[PDB]
Design a protein around this ligand. Structure first.
Ligand SMILES: *[C@@H]1O[C@H](CO)[C@@H](O[C@@H]2O[C@H](CO)[C@@H](O[C@@H]3O[C@H](CO[C@H]4O[C@H](CO[C@H]5O[C@H](CO)[C@@H](O)[C@H](O)[C@@H]5O)[C@@H](O)[C@H](O[C@H]5O[C@H](CO)[C@@H](O)[C@H](O)[C@@H]5O)[C@@H]4O)[C@@H](O)[C@H](O[C@H]4O[C@H](CO)[C@@H](O)[C@H](O)[C@@H]4O)[C@@H]3O)[C@H](O)[C@H]2NC(C)=O)[C@H](O)[C@H]1NC(C)=O
Ligand SMILES: *[C@@H]1O[C@H](CO)[C@@H](O[C@@H]2O[C@H](CO)[C@@H](O[C@@H]3O[C@H](CO[C@H]4O[C@H](CO)[C@@H](O)[C@H](O)[C@@H]4O)[C@@H](O)[C@H](O[C@H]4O[C@H](CO)[C@@H](O)[C@H](O)[C@@H]4O[C@H]4O[C@H](CO)[C@@H](O)[C@H](O)[C@@H]4O)[C@@H]3O)[C@H](O)[C@H]2NC(C)=O)[C@H](O)[C@H]1NC(C)=O
Ligand SMILES: *[C@@H]1O[C@H](CO)[C@@H](O[C@@H]2O[C@H](CO)[C@@H](O[C@@H]3O[C@H](CO[C@H]4O[C@H](CO)[C@@H](O)[C@H](O)[C@@H]4O)[C@@H](O)[C@H](O[C@H]4O[C@H](CO)[C@@H](O)[C@H](O)[C@@H]4O[C@H]4O[C@H](CO)[C@@H](O)[C@H](O)[C@@H]4O)[C@@H]3O)[C@H](O)[C@H]2NC(C)=O)[C@H](O)[C@H]1NC(C)=O
Ligand SMILES: *[C@@H]1O[C@H](CO[C@@H]2O[C@@H](C)[C@@H](O)[C@@H](O)[C@@H]2O)[C@@H](O[C@@H]2O[C@H](CO)[C@@H](O[C@@H]3O[C@H](CO)[C@@H](O)[C@H](O)[C@@H]3O)[C@H](O)[C@H]2NC(C)=O)[C@H](O)[C@H]1NC(C)=O
Ligand SMILES: *[C@@H]1O[C@H](CO[C@@H]2O[C@@H](C)[C@@H](O)[C@@H](O)[C@@H]2O)[C@@H](O[C@@H]2O[C@H](CO)[C@@H](O[C@@H]3O[C@H](CO)[C@@H](O)[C@H](O)[C@@H]3O)[C@H](O)[C@H]2NC(C)=O)[C@H](O)[C@H]1NC(C)=O
Ligand SMILES: *[C@@H]1O[C@H](CO)[C@@H](O[C@@H]2O[C@H](CO)[C@@H](O[C@@H]3O[C@H](CO)[C@@H](O)[C@H](O)[C@@H]3O)[C@H](O)[C@H]2NC(C)=O)[C@H](O)[C@H]1NC(C)=O
Ligand SMILES: *[C@@H]1O[C@H](CO[C@@H]2O[C@@H](C)[C@@H](O)[C@@H](O)[C@@H]2O)[C@@H](O[C@@H]2O[C@H](CO)[C@@H](O)[C@H](O)[C@H]2NC(C)=O)[C@H](O)[C@H]1NC(C)=O
Ligand SMILES: *[C@@H]1O[C@H](CO[C@@H]2O[C@@H](C)[C@@H](O)[C@@H](O)[C@@H]2O)[C@@H](O[C@@H]2O[C@H](CO)[C@@H](O)[C@H](O)[C@H]2NC(C)=O)[C@H](O)[C@H]1NC(C)=O
Ligand SMILES: *[C@@H]1O[C@H](CO[C@@H]2O[C@@H](C)[C@@H](O)[C@@H](O)[C@@H]2O)[C@@H](O[C@@H]2O[C@H](CO)[C@@H](O)[C@H](O)[C@H]2NC(C)=O)[C@H](O)[C@H]1NC(C)=O
Ligand SMILES: *[C@@H]1O[C@H](CO[C@@H]2O[C@@H](C)[C@@H](O)[C@@H](O)[C@@H]2O)[C@@H](O[C@@H]2O[C@H](CO)[C@@H](O)[C@H](O)[C@H]2NC(C)=O)[C@H](O)[C@H]1NC(C)=O
Ligand SMILES: *[C@@H]1O[C@H](CO)[C@@H](O[C@@H]2O[C@H](CO)[C@@H](O)[C@H](O)[C@H]2NC(C)=O)[C@H](O)[C@H]1NC(C)=O
Ligand SMILES: *[C@@H]1O[C@H](CO)[C@@H](O)[C@H](O)[C@H]1NC(C)=O
Ligand SMILES: *[C@@H]1O[C@H](CO)[C@@H](O)[C@H](O)[C@H]1NC(C)=O
Ligand SMILES: *[C@@H]1O[C@H](CO)[C@@H](O)[C@H](O)[C@H]1NC(C)=O
Ligand SMILES: *[C@H]1O[C@H](CO)[C@@H](O)[C@H](O)[C@H]1NC(C)=O
Lengths: 464, 465
């Protein structure tokens, strides 16, 4: 029993911190940073004993006043590290008052490494055996703490003539292991692997991770090695459930609610889909989802791809700039074509721009010396003209010295919902090709007097 | 030409960054990070044009106001990757204002990969052909940059004038124009030059050069060396009397020795005590070797290497194969062992695997209620028990209530010495007093025992002796 919370970045003041009040699990990361005015008194009776697990990482940076984590997160047992801070699952950095970690229930970091650095009061580090918590401690970075530069006096719980705490080896020295003066490190028998064990040493169930309340019972785990469902740790999610966030099982209707919740009010949320029995944010590469079944299916030809231009306009002046639109089938914005030359161009432009089916704004072709046709825009069938070039033009062609074809109007259809046509200084382009464009595109009658030049279109060609 | 500087780690302020001002080579890594108050103006007039090479890795993280590296590190040509950050020789992470890399002289990354991640303004990535720089690009991790979307606006030299001044190419089906910024192409050499570099006129650098040279086919005119550096020259191997150091230069014994004795004297924890091995000066001895002390020289071990296990509070009880495992590799026990093994599988082999290298025990050895044991021969190499600590009653070797014990060691072959303390034997029904009396002879404990230390009636009583 417990609530699942999203990740949080808590800075400046402790105010939003109380949002963790009821979380047993953070589905995301937790960053606590940059609290310079906090002092011990602020933390004394501040505690989140419900928190068992974080799916990503825990980062603590420059938080003043805090001397231990033993009361904040007494029961945090697993950091999964599904996402990392670079490659770290735990970061403790310039915590200037921190005297111990005290994460006395931390059993497993499932992915990622540990970075503990520049904590000038920090002791009880030498007493942690991290090889029990992470598979590879080779990339841990634990330096410049009090422990290094000084004598720490890391006193573990212990009888006047033994030492209660378990002891493990460094290279050759056996060393007793603890988090605090009051708390040992839990160390299980090796047959238990990462599953945990009860206090009498009996192994938790193989679907458990870290710890359990009773031995060999997959309903008595503190956390799951694989997936969580209805009070039980399971190896995979059974039908009819889906794997979510790499740790819990959810039903179709849950996935469906995320999908619709998002697609509506659009922040940074995704419209969730189903793929390989997972409920995920978006279809993988080569897949798309257009059905009410939510199911990713392989693209019939090339995948749809909406490119929204936050600057409103993009100018294409090279193969390199064209490539920036590679794979796009819908442009939200306007395109300006200004290509003065290049290599294997008609083919290069068709490769990168040939899948665009719609442009919501305008299309402008200007000083594109190198172009003889616009037919590289193989699939362009709609310009909406929701945005227009001054003078209310949705298609505009100026000073293109070699242009002799727009599209082949015997095969290509192009619709232009709003706006006018502008054609000036296209000397190799016959007026009949322009007039065919007006007919095909539905722009007949929109053009005013000096919009299409009679004298500067086709004057260097033979026409009709 | 200038100095070899050591690895640096620059944080918070730009003040310490000027420590690089004369460095040609950074021997170590260069990390610049967590500069929250810097602004573009702090970097408009800042340049380190002498830096040519970094032997380890370059890492930039959260440096505010820095927009390009083209003025900072214009001549950086090689990152050798001798040590890496994880598996990366180049790391650009959460560089909030970086618009381009601009490392337009970077020709080679000799070992390791590139990680350029979460740089919200970062462009001029699609324009870089990394295959000229790294033999394998397969572990590169270049994600969550401005370049992932459709509005970088990358533009290479010549474009405004309709020209492609850069050596553009197609790699797979991807066009890559090969530039670093609007005004700097990526350098490319004829195929015959391989990774050696060439002059502006296309003429090959010498085969001992790496990346670039001031003149063709001369190993004293290299910008950086393929193999090692000595006395103004790039060389394939270090000659006598020099050692290979940090995988790029030749140094002498005395240099390696001075390093060793700075670190020994001052184990403040940012160093190693350097050693000689296979004509290299290195941080530590590899596995199988230990360091001959009088001349810094790694010498191999006669059999497995010495390993002293210091027991907590001077004792440990072995009552399973699992606990015995915790002592695998030990050749010296500092403390005392208690054996309490009642059952299990394949124990003589398992126990021999984990305890067979123990040569010496400094305290006492006690076997009691070890019902499963037929012999103590699993202690294959045990030759000394010192008795520096003893069991109550001044015993260094104590055997009580072991119902199947028939052998201690085979006293034909095995020699065991017991420096101090006495023997105790009671309730060993299958162990002949001959064996015990032999052990007394072998170990030098004959005449230490009092009358009840060894039982006449409860050692061997159930065996033919
Ligand atoms: C791995 O995971 C496991 C499983 O989650 C986890 O084990 C749990 O650990 C927690 C904490 O270690 C346990 O919770 C505590 O239980 C304490 C014992 O509670 C029982 O006895 C109480 C009497 O205690 C006094 O008297 C006895 C006898 O003389 C003495 O031994 C004690 O020292 C002490 O003086 C009693 O209060 C309690 O009875 C009440 O509650 C029960 C609920 O079962 C109810 O049935 C009764 O009617 C009655 O109302 C119970 O029977 C308990 O003392 C402790 O209390 C804490 O909070 C209070 C605030 O009220 C503080 O004052 C106090 O300082 C304590 O912090 C708390 O409830 C839990 O029992 C474990 N579960 C299991 C199955 O073992 C491990 O921690 C994880 N393992 C590792 C290594 O990390
Ligand atoms: C703390 O607790 C953990 C959990 O119990 C414990 O055990 C370790 O478990 C981890 C996590 O499960 C293990 O690491 C994984 O290993 C498997 C398999 O590795 C072997 O086989 C592969 C080939 O199949 C070899 O390459 C490899 O060398 C091994 O021989 C991998 O499947 C895992 O990698 C993938 O999955 C991860 C989890 O989803 C991904 O995050 C990761 O990026 C990899 O992605 C790939 O698989 C996905 C499908 O699942 C797919 O979606 C991706 O696109 C991609 O294809 C991972 O390496 C580890 O082996 C366990 N270690 C041991 C000793 O058993 C820890 O031991 C414990 N810590 C301690 C000290 O107790
Ligand atoms: C950038 O510039 C470089 C030139 O500087 C250029 O060439 C490449 O140079 C690198 C570095 O020299 C070469 O990488 C080495 O390759 C050798 C050859 O391996 C042979 O044998 C093995 C084993 O069966 C096979 O895998 C292989 O097929 C070969 O037949 C390796 O020996 C090297 O590995 C050792 O050195 C590494 C780097 O120090 C170590 O990290 C590694 O563990 C190895 O160490 C062991 O051997 C060392 C002796 O070499 C010894 O010092 C250690 O103690 C230890 O025992 C290394 O991988 C690479 O092959 C060159 N590549 C090419 C194409 O020639 C790059 O090409 C240039 N970049 C670009 C894009 O141009
Ligand atoms: C598919 O799953 C949804 C969502 O289930 C919820 O989230 C999952 C990830 C798990 O953590 C679930 O344990 C969790 O319930 C189901 O909807 C949920 O159903 C439960 C049970 O009916 C609802 O709780 C109840 O609400 C009533 C009346 O308000 C109370 O009197 C009950 O005591 C009980 O608390 C819960 O409100 C509801 N949640 C949502 C978001 O709708 C859904 O039933 C399931 N659908 C199918 C087809 O199986
Ligand atoms: C070990 O090598 C070092 C470094 O020498 C330099 O690098 C090598 C790889 C080669 O390329 C060499 O050709 C090159 O010189 C030698 O360093 C030198 O050490 C001497 C002795 O300490 C320094 O001492 C001098 O002492 C007096 C003090 O009164 C001053 O007058 C001098 O200014 C100087 O301090 C000398 O400066 C130093 N040279 C350099 C360039 O670093 C080292 O001698 C050599 N050791 C042995 C035993 O051969
Ligand atoms: C490859 O390496 C060559 C050779 O070092 C580089 O060319 C050299 O560039 C340096 C500047 O980095 C030039 O130095 C300058 O000299 C003048 C002296 O009049 C002075 O104004 C400057 O302060 C500076 O010191 C040097 O002239 C030049 N030499 C040659 C052979 O052209 C070159 O940049 C490297 N890279 C490439 C891509 O070729
Ligand atoms: C092209 O996009 C514009 C701008 O859309 C804005 O940013 C988007 C990412 C999207 O999330 C919008 O809601 C943002 O407003 C669209 O114009 C807006 O349309 C939305 C309806 O979704 C409406 O709320 C606004 O009033 C519109 N006006 C503006 C300037 O924001 C436009 O509809 C898109 N065109 C096509 C054909 O998709
Ligand atoms: C050229 O296409 C137009 C418009 O087609 C519509 O809009 C496109 C963007 C595309 O998504 C199509 O599915 C649409 O039909 C044709 O005009 C349409 O004609 C049909 C039948 O007469 C009618 O149902 C549409 O509503 C019309 N819309 C408009 C804007 O007139 C036009 O006929 C096509 N040219 C030819 C000869 O096929
Ligand atoms: C066995 O070991 C003890 C303790 O050794 C010290 O602590 C270890 C963890 C390790 O770091 C050793 O190098 C330490 O010396 C020995 O007692 C010490 O003996 C040394 C000489 O070896 C002496 O100079 C110290 O003063 C002693 N320190 C203490 C804690 O008393 C003990 O002598 C060793 N017994 C053997 C194998 O002869
Ligand atoms: C059995 O060993 C003893 C003791 O040997 C010494 O201690 C061992 C742990 C090992 O380190 C040996 O190299 C040591 O010499 C032998 O008696 C010793 O004999 C040597 C050589 O003659 C002499 O220098 C010692 O002082 C002697 N020590 C004692 C206490 O007697 C004995 O000879 C060995 N038996 C066999 C099979 O050779
Ligand atoms: C880089 O080298 C220059 C050498 O010019 C150093 O500047 C000199 O510093 C010394 C030592 O105090 C002064 O005596 C000289 O007068 C300086 N020379 C000039 C011309 O400025 C500088 O110290 C070096 N920088 C670093 C970081 O070591
Ligand atoms: C925690 O749980 C209580 C009990 O329902 C609730 O009223 C309170 O508002 C919760 N805290 C938060 C931050 O949601
Ligand atoms: C351009 O369009 C706007 C509305 O979208 C309209 O009010 C205006 O009349 C147009 N300008 C011209 C030149 O007619
Ligand atoms: C045991 O040995 C010690 C040290 O030599 C000695 O002082 C003591 O008298 C001996 N007596 C016993 C316990 O048999
Ligand atoms: C950085 O330099 C400032 C002065 O600019 C100084 O206050 C401080 O000691 C330095 N900060 C650290 C910790 O590097």
């Amino acid at each position: 029993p417990g609530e699942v919370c999203p990740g949080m970045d808590i800075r400046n003041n402790l105010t939003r911190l109380h949002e963790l009040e009821n979380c047993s699990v953070i589905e995301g990361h937790l960053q606590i940073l940059l609290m310079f005015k906090t002092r011990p008194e602020d933390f004394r009776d501040l505690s989140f004993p419900k928190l068992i697990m974080i799916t990503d990482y825990l980062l603590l940076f420059r938080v003043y006043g805090l001397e231990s984590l033993k009361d904040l997160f007494p029961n945090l047992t697993v950091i999964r590290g599904s996402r990392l801070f670079f490659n770290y699952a735990l970061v403790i950095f310039e915590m200037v008052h921190l005297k111990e970690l005290g994460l006395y229930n931390l059993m497993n970091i499932t992915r990622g490494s540990v970075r503990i650095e520049k904590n000038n009061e920090l002791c009880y580090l030498a007493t942690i055996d991290w090889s029990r918590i992470l598979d590879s401690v080779e990339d841990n970075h634990i330096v410049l703490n009090k422990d290094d530069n000084e004598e720490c006096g890391d006193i573990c719980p212990g009888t006047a003539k033994g030492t209660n705490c378990p002891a493990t080896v460094i290279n050759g020295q056996f060393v007793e292991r603890c988090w605090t003066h009051s708390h040992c490190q839990k160390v299980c028998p090796t047959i238990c692997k990462s599953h945990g064990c009860t206090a009498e040493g009996l192994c938790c169930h193989s679907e458990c991770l870290g710890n359990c309340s009773q031995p060999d019972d997959p309903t008595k785990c503190v956390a799951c090695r694989n997936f969580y469902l209805d009070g039980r740790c399971v190896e995979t999610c059974p039908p009819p459930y889906y794997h979510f966030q790499d740790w819990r099982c959810v039903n179709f209707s849950f996935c469906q609610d995320l999908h619709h919740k998002c697609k509506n009010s659009r922040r940074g949320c995704h419209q969730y889909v189903i793929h390989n029995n997972k409920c995920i944010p978006e279809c993988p590469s080569g897949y798309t989802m257009n059905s009410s079944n939510l199911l990713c299916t392989p693209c019939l030809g090339p995948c749809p791809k909406v490119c929204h231009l936050l600057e409103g306009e993009k100018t294409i002046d090279s193969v390199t700039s064209a490539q920036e639109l590679r794979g796009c089938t819908v442009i939200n914005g306007s395109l300006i074509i200004n290509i003065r030359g290049g290599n294997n161009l008609a083919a290069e432009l068709e490769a990168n721009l040939g899948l665009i089916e719609e442009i919501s704004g305008y299309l402008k072709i200007r000083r594109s010396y190198a172009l003889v046709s616009l037919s590289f825009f193989r699939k362009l069938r709609l310009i909406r003209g929701e945005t227009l070039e001054i003078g209310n033009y949705s298609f505009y062609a100026l000073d293109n010295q070699n242009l002799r074809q727009l599209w082949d109007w015997s095969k290509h259809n192009l619709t232009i919902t709003q706006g006018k046509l502008f054609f000036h200084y296209n000397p190799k382009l016959c007026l009949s090709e322009i007039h065919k464009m007006e007919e095909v595109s539905g722009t007949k009658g929109r053009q005013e007097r000096n919009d299409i030049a009679l004298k500067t279109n086709g004057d260097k060609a033979s026409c009709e």
